[PDB]
Symmetry: D3
């Protein structure tokens, strides 16, 4: 099946700037389904677990302080090739390099010791699965129809 | 204190139509702070506790079917006179009577056996307290600064 | 039945200013269904039939010049109490008196010898019937499901 | 003259999802002039005529069912190099590949047996001319000034 | 003549929150013409002249601190009955009482010792004249055609 | 420091079309700070000085008539790598070539004898400095905090 689920994190800079709604609307408008979502305040341990692949990098500590600065909104998006699609929508890691039209391209620029880039998106199906597990329990993910779902059925 | 918290529910019709982000943005743009939020699927038992005041009304059952139709997004908004403000932003219960500019006025219209109207908003500080305890534990509510908070402090 | 159809005309001033899409979106977002629509260029004869009720008024001629100035977009919107709802969304006849949030309130202001106000909306179910027959043949009106129609059915 | 006319079809998925207005606004905002437009319900014959170049392709039947599923909004856009411009605005055929900022990039993703991609745009001046003829009579296309037209006159 | 000019000030809270463009767009979309505009940083002396009518009120000092907190954008809007129209678009002085759809209604809420409300708008043609002279020289005010001006001329 | 200031001009076509607000919002949303701004009516001399590098080009005269046609809004934007960032946001010189999502890509298309492209952005730090000087006096540029400035401080 082409249907995939990816993990998205609306980072502290987006939350503080009041951009939660604008970001969610971009996914809803794209046709992606929100099967899970909640506002939480990530602590060091969970943050270092999510960003485990960067534990041995110079900017690690700044990243942890950044992602745990204020509450974030974690959510699981479901849809056709959702992982690559959401990555494309996010834009280049450093927002100054992100193309106009992408989330980072339109909303990000300024940075602290960490490259503040509005949101996080799983880079692969493998990462998505591992990441979704860290933030969501099966009981927090739902199966339900979005308005136009019936339109895409294959007779 | 003028700062108060209110409970908002982005109803199944809003979720299905993909209006979650647009509704949330209206509050963020107003200066309201999201101190708690999560997508959940309300069951009949919890729904009836929330809408206890309507238990004796003709539309009760249909209202419970409606609010439990699909998952919803429950959230707590904090800000100066948040309760009356959000109620004002929401608009009249029946979307056809809601003024343009309000959430129900701009997004609502069609109905089922229940009057579908995009969102729910606590009707008083007392009710918000009750409704918030119904959906959230203290550990799901947060205190943090929004970008412009410093501007208003003395 | 609460479902009714109303006739809307996106006037020459709206067309010239490039507001067709924005106006249409307001209706789509409300949950109203476009069951008919087309860009046409109304001539004096058809215009006078449409605005027959104003034939004896001082501003009649200027109103006919205005509505026939450039092409317009005539469309039929369907939905629960569509007539009064669209009228509500449109706002006061004179844009300066129209409330912010309404179409005339947000987009209208400047006038000519006619009170330019972005759009026209039928004033009753009876008038809509009459006006729709004036601009559309039955074959130009369609019945189809909008994405969320199923949500409201029992 | 650089002024060209292209044929645009707001396909059934966009109509059902209530995206007609948002799509039209993008063209109006770009400065393109709507010289013709109407909501119609395409039947098999007309659909197979419009997509004549794909009659011998595997996905043909799905495309015909798709484009004739519900009423559509056909319109003729006029403006400087309108054909290539509108194609660029549309984005890649498969919306998952369309760049953020384009119509398909922002609005499309899910597919049925046909690659549902929000809208159709003539691929060439030749196609535009042939396509405009299939849907519009000369009497349905108009010549009128848009607000800023006077600004671009060449003294 | 119905065409008049009014003075608007996009207050420090609006500037800090990055709402300058959104506020300006509301006026442009209404059909109002920007004939003058500039970012400046008002000092106490100029601020008190602008708000002279409030010199004897309890909130005077806090109002002067507020309007001089950060730079602001002062602009002159021209159009049919521009004064009452902009006042209508702005909404009630206290944002919590401002109707959804208005600028203060959609963007304002939080306050300091002064009632922070996004923008200032002249309350009469007479006051606008006075306020415009306070911030602009004749050479900073312009007469030019907006795209659709020709549509309204006879 | 990565913080730079660039000079932006909302050209006559954008002013006449009532696009001033929409353009400003894109920068504000990106996180760029407006440290200077004002509506002025550029005269020939100042225009030929701003576009000094094009004095020996065929389209020079058309450009001067264009940029001095109606009042414009000049503004100085401040932010991390603002010069390259704003250039990216502007899009390709000829708006028909500008990508969807960019200012020129979304708003520009039609041209007169000059390639009307909605706005102007300094092409380099050197140009920015020279251009800012032509339109703004030090007394018209301000230092003040934007809402989220505190969020990016490097502890
Ligand atoms: N070199 C860096 N310096 C500081 N912070 C960085 C750097 N690289 C990445 N970051 C931060 O760490 C996050 C994760 O890094 P990475 O996985 O490379 O980016 P991506 O979000 O595109 O997958 C980035 O989104 C950004 O928030
Ligand atoms: N008469 C009615 N028939 C069907 N449903 C109704 C009716 N009145 C209200 N409702 C539904 O019940 C919900 C709760 O009722 P009430 O508290 O009176 O409205 P509100 O949500 O505006 O406070 C309304 O939001 C609407 O969804
Ligand atoms: N007094 C007037 N002078 C000039 N034009 C007017 C006047 N009153 C109304 N109009 C124009 O005639 C149109 C039709 O009049 P009416 O039906 O009374 O208003 P409405 O369109 O709100 O139903 C109005 O929309 C407006 O365009
Ligand atoms: N391989 C495919 N499978 C299913 N549907 C397709 C496929 N390719 C194209 N389509 C559908 O047929 C339409 C026309 O095909 P084509 O001309 O190649 O795309 P375009 O709209 O970019 O010109 C596409 O827009 C899409 O709706
Ligand atoms: N009672 C008050 N306490 C504190 N500040 C106030 C009070 N009333 C008004 N203000 C502030 O003073 C400004 C000017 O007052 P006033 O002219 O009465 O309101 P308006 O700006 O709506 O015309 C108001 O916009 C608001 O910023
Ligand atoms: N070949 C041309 N013909 C007419 N006008 C042009 C041409 N090239 C550029 N222009 C106009 O002159 C302006 C400045 O030229 P240039 O610096 O090359 O573009 P840019 O704004 O991308 O730096 C362009 O933005 C456009 O307004
Ligand atoms: Cl990118
Ligand atoms: Cl949907
Ligand atoms: Cl209401
Ligand atoms: Cl904020
Ligand atoms: Cl009204
Ligand atoms: Cl729908
Ligand atoms: Cl693309
Ligand atoms: Cl135009
Ligand atoms: Cl009000
Ligand atoms: Cl205009
Ligand atoms: Cl580009
Ligand atoms: Cl900010
Ligand atoms: Mg990564
Ligand atoms: Mg209630
Ligand atoms: Mg009438
Ligand atoms: Mg093709
Ligand atoms: Mg006052
Ligand atoms: Mg240049």
């Amino acid at each position: 099946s082409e249907t995939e689920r990816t993990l998205v994190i609306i980072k502290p800079d987006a939350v503080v700037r009041g951009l939660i709604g604008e970001i969610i609307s971009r996914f809803e408008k794209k046709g992606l389904k929100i099967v899970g979502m909640k506002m939480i305040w990530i602590d060091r341990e969970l943050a270092e677990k999510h960003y485990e692949e960067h534990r041995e990098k110079p900017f690690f500590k700044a990243l942890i302080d950044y992602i745990t600065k204020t509450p974030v909104v974690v959510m699981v998006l479901e849809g056709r090739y959702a992982v690559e699609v959401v990555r494309k929508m996010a834009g280049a890691t450093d927002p100054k390099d992100a193309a106009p039209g992408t989330i980072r391209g339109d909303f990000g620029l300024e940075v602290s010791d960490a490259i503040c880039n509005v949101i996080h998106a799983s880079d692969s199906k493998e990462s998505a699965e591992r990441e979704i597990s860290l933030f969501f329990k099966p009981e927090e993910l739902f199966e339900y129809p979005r308005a136009a779902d019936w339109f895409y059925k294959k007779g």
